Design a protein around this ligand. Sequence first.
Ligand code: TLL
Ligand code: MG
Length: 373
Amino acid sequence: MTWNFHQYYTNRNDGLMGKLVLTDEEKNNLKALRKIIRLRTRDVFEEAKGIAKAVKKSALTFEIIQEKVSTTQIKHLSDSEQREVAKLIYEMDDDARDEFLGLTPRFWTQGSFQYDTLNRPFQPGQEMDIDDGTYMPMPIFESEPKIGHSLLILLVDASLKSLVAENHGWKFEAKQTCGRIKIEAEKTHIDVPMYAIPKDELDSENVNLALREGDRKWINSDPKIVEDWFNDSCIRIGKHLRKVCRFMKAWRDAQWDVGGPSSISLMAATVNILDSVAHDASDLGETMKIIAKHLPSEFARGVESPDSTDEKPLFPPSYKHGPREMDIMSKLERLPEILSSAESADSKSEALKKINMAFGNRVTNSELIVLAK
Ligand SMILES: CN1c2c([nH]c(N)nc2=O)NC[C@@H]1CNc1ccc(C(=O)N[C@@H](CCC(=O)N[C@@H](CCC(=O)O)C(=O)O)C(=O)O)cc1
Ligand SMILES: [Mg+2]
């Protein structure tokens, strides 16, 4: 009794991959959602820039500026927020207004869904986490850019909130790093962080994330850093990297209804292990056992972000562990034992049941599990 699980994992119909990967349709529906947001955000900025251009032509009273604001999509903000938008437009200097009039919101063409490892949600209440940033090409700024933090966030909020008003089942929720649209019926939420970038390329640093609460209004955070890291890793290691990342993310979804380690911490740890430990990429069952064996050590040490400019660990080191991190360490230690137990189970039926204690009950096809060669 030594069971092989390579097809349990990799089978694109009945295997774990077949249960995790979104259909071409479901993917296109997320793309459609994403497109609706981007269009509305662009539309809102035009409406606002429309008012700004009228002010450049003639400096209107605040009352007239406010009336114009009130009949834009910005009408979906509160009264005080509309006043604030109208006041910011009223207060613009010539230099600032010309900047604003040249600003159109930008979106990332290279962005995939979770580095192309977005899994179908497993447990009831679990939702797909989709991020689509809005990039604001502006002059490089020291503290604050000509176009203010406040105005930009208000306009993005107006965009998201105006969509929420026109679409039943949608809700808005403001977060630290982003505005969020939650669509519970579609088990989906999409986060719209807002970044400031240089007008002329020059993209290394000076990607600035807008923070909604607190003293710092902007922080340096370039999502391209982690994206490049991971894409390069997949090239260096092989096509199985994304698969094993999907599997660990699925394991996480199965072990915790809410909570568990971040997907990125699992990706960083998995990459570290596959770079440093011999494995056979032709057997994902053997490969997963190798990953399972080494994860506890990766997490115990704390998981460093692949972005060297991020001082905060993706997962805390052992000495900073509370009940939640202790819980996570505990399940990580169980994982390699679960995989070995499945491997030596009495039957196909039992082997499936045991491995499904790691990844949840999804795969129903025991025939994917085969007697070892
Ligand atoms: C890559 N980048 C980069 C960054 N950082 C670093 N460190 N290195 C980098 O290389 N960050 C940002 C930078 C972004 N590059 C971009 C360049 C252009 C665009 C862009 O979306 N342009 C259009 C969008 C409108 C549209 O197409 N509308 C469509 C539909 C819009 C839709 O839904 O998609 C229409 O006509 O209807 C525009 O100019 O308005 C988006 C991103
Ligand atoms: Mg998100």
